[PDB]
Copies of this chain bind each other. A is one copy, B any other.
């Protein structure tokens, strides 16, 4: 059988009102040996009912036990160590996977915004582009919003490694040409470990 550790979703750690969760997933569970005990230690000390929650999932011909530890925004963000310790009679000895937040001096990202091409205006819907370059680590998350409300029809390319060690991602929000022309104020919020307040938001208007 095997264990698999997973880090919180970038947005879950950068926004306080959310919940960072570290996910421990056990696989090839089989049927006669499903008692997979769970041990989680934060940076060493064991965190018992840290939250710590499991639940059986039957398929293939093996089970798949999963436990999930609610992390602390600041610890993960300060590079603390999360330990998943799986044990069960079908094994000789305890397996242990650790996991940590990427390491490196963090480079604050720069957030520029560009309007549509004079040429794409000929069409029905135009594209608002939001650049976020020169950053590290690659964990980041962008969103868009117009007047106090969130648009949805947008997409965001995964971070790519730039030639100077920093990262860069492009995020494209779409609109009926009308709003763009009506003079609407679009706004690409960027969330990142490196920014002041773990947040920024640069505008964009006709």
Binding site for B on A (CB under 8 A): 110, 112-117, 119-120, 127, 129, 131, 133, 153, 155-158, 160-163, 168-170, 172, 174, 202
A132 to chain B, nearest CB (A): 11
- When chains A and B are docked, how far (Å) is the Cα of A119 from the Cα of B168? 17
Q: A163 and B155 in contact (CB under 8 A), knowing A117-B113, A127-B133?
A: yes
Copies of this protein in the complex: 2
Residues of B within 8 A of A129 (CB): 114, 129, 131, 170
Residues of B within 8 A of A172 (CB): 131, 133, 168, 170
Choice from B115, B120, B157, B168 contacting A110 with Cβ under 8 Å: B120
11 additional A-B pairs beyond A112-B120, A114-B117, beta carbons within 8 Å, are A110-B120, A112-B116, A114-B116, A114-B129, A117-B131, A127-B131, A131-B172, A155-B162, A157-B157, A163-B174, A170-B170
- When chains A and B are docked, how far (Å) is the Cα of A169 from the Cα of B155? 10
- When chains A and B are docked, how far (Å) is the Cα of A16 from the Cα of B114? 35
- In the complex formed, the residue of B with least CB distance to A156 is B160
A47 to chain B, nearest CB (A): 38
Q: Which of A114, A116, A174 has the most CB atoms of chain B within a 10 A radius of its CB?
A: A114
Give the 9 A-B residue pairs with the shortest CB-CB distance, closest first. Answer: A112-B117, A170-B170, A157-B157, A114-B114, A112-B120, A157-B160, A112-B119, A155-B160, A155-B162
